[PDB]
Write a protein that binds this DNA or RNA. Sequence first.
RNA 1: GAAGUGUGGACGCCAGUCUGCAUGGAGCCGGCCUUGAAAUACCACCCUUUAAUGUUUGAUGUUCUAACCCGAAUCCGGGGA
Length: 222
Amino acid sequence: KRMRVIREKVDATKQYDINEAIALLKELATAKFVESVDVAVNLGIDARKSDQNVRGATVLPHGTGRSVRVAVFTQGANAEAAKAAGAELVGMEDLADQIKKGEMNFDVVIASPDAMRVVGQLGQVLGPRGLMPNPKVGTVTPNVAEAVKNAKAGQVRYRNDKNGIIHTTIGKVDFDADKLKENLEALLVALKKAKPTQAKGVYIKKVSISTTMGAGVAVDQA
RNA sequence: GAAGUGUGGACGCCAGUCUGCAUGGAGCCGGCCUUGAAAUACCACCCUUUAAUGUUUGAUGUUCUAACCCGAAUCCGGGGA
């Protein structure tokens, strides 16, 4: 398999460093278009417990302003307030089907509390990409009209799901070695600071810099 | 972390791919990637179950063996956990 040429390049036993990772990373992205790299690390926290969850944002290395395509989901009169607001895409719970069909043409998604449980059920697709509206993120609130306006002000959110560890998009392979590593470190630093107090033991059991699809490489967070 | 392929095998009973095996045609990865009766890619949740192996451990049945009981002066014999 083309893995043959991708395996001889990576050593599953060896734990490469940050700088080294990015280097080997580029040659592992030999494919079509510009590949997007991600960073997955193992967290040692009690899943179920809410106080164990880790969520936040890190100032990584473009794409804010009138260009950003907002998608609001409200109910009742809140729909009109969103339209006159300036939201490109507006609608109720009915538009929760089209997105499910394959429509993803949008950058940010705003919505109201009354329609959070219904959207939550369909948060398995927007959850990983950090497109799921949230209170702290200032994405969910009655005054949606103000939300969309306050937008275009400038964050890569990170969370968890139902399968294992945690990750986030670091950048693309086209980027230089210095740039990429410059991001990997920033993300790790923003993660260790998000470590819950109750969490005991090794927070990051194992770090691994791997693109969307490209020979997973384990690295040292330090 | 060579198996994928198209006709090739196993230790507890049923299928998708994995390794030191052996090779051709099936194309180099790929298979993969728009057929009704044979159909899609990424990090806690009912499985998270089941199946197998090693260690610790609970109950039952068998054999053997030191306590105990009886016979005998003793040796020892009979019975027997």
